[PDB]
């Protein structure tokens, strides 16, 4: 929330209320509605831990991510 901070901005200040409501409903994607995150200005490495935990249920998730990132290059992909 602090990446591009406009203190005198009602919209960015109203997003805090939306983020708190989503956090009230037990949503794990609460930072989602922050403007810097939605525009791709910020990401955290903590998502990569979620990628690893997802691999216990989705053994393909790591491969798919690296294929999108170009980290692994399979001919014909």
């Amino acid at each position: 929330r602090f990446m591009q901070f406009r203190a005198k901005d009602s919209y960015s200040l109203a997003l805090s209320k939306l983020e708190k409501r989503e956090r009230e409903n037990g949503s794990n994607l609460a930072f989602m509605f922050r403007l810097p995150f939605a525009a791709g200005r910020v990401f955290s490495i903590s998502m990569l831990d979620t990628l690893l935990y997802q691999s216990f249920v989705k053994d393909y998730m790591i491969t798919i991510t690296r294929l999108l990132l170009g980290l692994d290059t399979t001919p014909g992909s």
């Binding site: 170009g70 980290l71 692994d72 290059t73």
Partner: protein, 34 residues
Amino acid sequence: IAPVLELAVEYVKGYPPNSPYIGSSPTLCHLLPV
């Protein structure tokens, strides 16, 4: 829109020579001639 069918200094292109670590997937890249 056409319908989808049921049936179907200049740079060199090569792999980076000195891979920094083991496991680095070789990607064909735009390379300097020298």
